[PDB]
Amino acid sequence: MLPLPDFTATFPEPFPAGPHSERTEHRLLDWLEEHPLLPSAKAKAVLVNITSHGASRTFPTADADDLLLFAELLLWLTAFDDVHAEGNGVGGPAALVDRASELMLVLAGGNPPRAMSPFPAVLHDLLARFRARASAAAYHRLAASLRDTLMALVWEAHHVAKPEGVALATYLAMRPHTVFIKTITAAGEILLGYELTDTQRALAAVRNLETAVANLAGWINDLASYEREMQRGRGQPLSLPTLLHARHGGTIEEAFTRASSMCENEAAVARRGITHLAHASPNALTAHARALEDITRSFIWHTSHARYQGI
* Chain residues in the site for its own copies (CB under 8 A): 93-94, 97-98, 100-101, 104-105, 107-108, 110, 112-113, 136-137, 140-141, 143-144, 147-148, 150-152, 154-155, 158, 169-170, 173-174, 177, 182, 198, 207, 210-211
- CA-CA distances (angstroms) from residue 247 to 155, 164, 168? 21, 9, 8
The binder of 147, among Mg ion, its own copies, none, by C-beta within 5 to 8 A per type, is its own copies
Q: How far is the CB of 209 from its own copies (least distance, A)?
A: 12
> Residue 195 in 3-state DSSP?
coil
Nearest one of 146, 130, 140 to 80, comparing CA atoms: 146
Instruction: Consult the annotation and say whether 102 binds a ligand.
Output: no
Between 29 and 154, CB nearer to Mg ion: 154
Give every CB contact of residue 200 below 8 A, 6+ residues apart in sequence: 206, 282, 284, 285
Point out which span in 12-20, 176-184, 251-259, 302-310 binds Mg ion (CB under 5 A). 176-184
Residue 180 falls in which region: left (phi positive, over 0), alpha (psi -120 to 50) or beta: left
148 known ligand binder: no
Q: Return the number of the residue (60 or 87) whose C-beta is nearest Mg ion.
A: 87
The answer to whether 49 is annotated as binding is no
Q: Which of residues 67-106 bind Mg ion (CB under 5 A)?
A: 81
CB contact set of 179 (below 8 Å; sequence gap of 6+): 214, 217, 218, 221
The answer to whether the peptide bond before residue 14 is cis (omega within 30 degrees of 0) is: yes
Could you list the residues known to form a binding site for Mg(2+), using ranges. 81-82, 86, 156, 221, 225, 229
Which spans of this chain sit near Mg ion (rule: CB under 5 A)? Answer: 81, 178
